[PDB]
Design an enzyme around this catalytic site. Structure first.
Site, short mmCIF file in Angstrom:
data_model
loop_
_atom_site.label_atom_id
_atom_site.label_comp_id
_atom_site.label_asym_id
_atom_site.label_seq_id
_atom_site.Cartn_x
_atom_site.Cartn_y
_atom_site.Cartn_z
N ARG A 277 1.77 2.10 -0.43
CA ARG A 277 0.88 0.94 -0.51
C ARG A 277 -0.11 1.06 -1.67
NH1 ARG A 277 -0.77 4.17 3.84
NH2 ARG A 277 -2.69 5.25 3.20
N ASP B 262 -6.18 2.61 -6.11
CA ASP B 262 -7.05 2.77 -4.95
C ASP B 262 -7.69 4.15 -4.90
OD1 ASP B 262 -8.42 2.65 -2.58
OD2 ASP B 262 -6.76 1.78 -1.44
#
Ligand SMILES: Cc1cc2cc(n1)-c1cnn(C)c1OCCC[C@@H](C)CN1/C(=N/C2=O)Nc2ccc(CN3CCN(C)CC3)cc21
Ligand SMILES: [Cl-]
Length: 299
Positions: free
Chosen positions: A142, A156
């Site tokens: 992800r 991220d």
């Protein structure tokens, strides 16, 4: 001890932007698509704009610090921040979204060549973070984004920690943590190293090789530690030759020093990428505006 971080933090005016639409919303917050038009430079740069209260501004600034300090073709670079009421992170638009969603949706059109190149590129990105003494602590499918199907980048950095001085471990405290991607020593002792990122790399590769299956699907997070202690690991994906699965199993050794290093992961997957169908067995593999400038070309 360490070297001065002379990175530049670019403060972007809100008038230089045009939010276009919402790309995503969730736990992280909200990500937007938009166009950045710097100054009177005849250029338009597609961007992602991310918002997460003083706690929120603090954490997004910690993330901005990290992203401003990395420069590598397989790591997402910070373009700048916008000092509105809530602080906005401005980064490069990655038009195909996260790789987890990508492999799930394009299952029947993903060949061994793409799977193995993605493994090389992720390992290059991680080996670069290791060069910068950065432990990501949240590597996962992800958190790999798709610039093009041929070019992915790690993103991220909300959990990323800079190992300073001569420190080798990062000793964390409480806080939500993705149990099913972390090394056993991270679950049990909250110790994080580049070698615990290697374990997460192994789970990430498993995610890719199963076309986006959920690790330990059905098992709640609290038994992961005990399952792992018994010696149980994620199973061999169907397309994976023993050559590829063995690499993943090595990422999951109890002894963190026994796991492969990212620079060795680069070498091994790169050899396998030269003859992809010898290492992954996939059905049908062999049949699978004017002034816009990509951020990678705006230097
Ligand atoms: C440098 C950079 C770029 C970007 C994000 C971050 N960093 C970042 C950094 N931390 N965090 C949490 C981040 O956000 C990630 C989470 C949401 C993301 C998938 C959204 N998202 C997107 N993100 C970025 O560009 N690009 C997208 C392009 C298209 C679509 C449409 N879906 C695609 C897949 N299926 C479901 C169809 C619908 C969604 C897109
Ligand atoms: Cl989890």
């Amino acid at each position: 001890g360490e070297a001065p971080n002379q990175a530049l933090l670019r403060i972007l005016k809100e008038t230089e932007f045009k939010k276009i639409k919402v790309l995503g919303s969730g736990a992280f917050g909200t990500v937007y698509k938009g166009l950045w038009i710097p100054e009177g430079e005849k250029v338009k740069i597609p961007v992602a704009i991310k918002e997460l209260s003083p706690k929120a501004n603090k954490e997004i600034l910690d993330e901005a610090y990290v992203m401003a300090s990395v420069d590598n073709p397989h790591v997402c670079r910070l373009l700048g921040i916008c000092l509105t009421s809530t602080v906005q992170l401005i980064t490069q638009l990655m038009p195909f979204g996260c790789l987890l969603d990508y492999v799930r949706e394009h299952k029947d059109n993903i060949g061994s060549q793409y799977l193995l190149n993605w493994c090389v590129q992720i390992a290059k990105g991680m080996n670069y973070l290791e060069d910068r003494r950065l432990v990501h602590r949240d590597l996962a499918a992800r958190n790999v984004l798709v610039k093009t199907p041929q070019h992915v980048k790690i993103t991220d950095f909300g959990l990323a920690k800079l190992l300073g001085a001569e420190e080798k471990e990062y000793h964390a405290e409480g806080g939500k943590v993705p149990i099913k991607w972390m090394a056993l020593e991270s679950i049990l002792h909250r110790i994080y190293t580049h070698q615990s990122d290697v374990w997460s790399y192994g789970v990430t590769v498993w995610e890719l090789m199963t076309f986006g299956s959920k690790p330990y699907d059905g098992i709640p997070a609290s038994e992961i530690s005990s399952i792992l202690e018994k010696g149980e690991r994620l199973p061999q994906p169907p397309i994976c030759t023993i050559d590829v699965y063995m690499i993943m199993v090595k990422c999951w050794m109890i002894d963190a020093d026994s796991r492969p290093k990212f620079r060795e992961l680069i070498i091994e997957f790169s050899k396998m990428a030269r003859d992809p169908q010898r290492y992954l067995v996939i059905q049908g593999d062999e049949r699978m505006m004017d002034d816009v400038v990509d951020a990678d070309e705006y230097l």
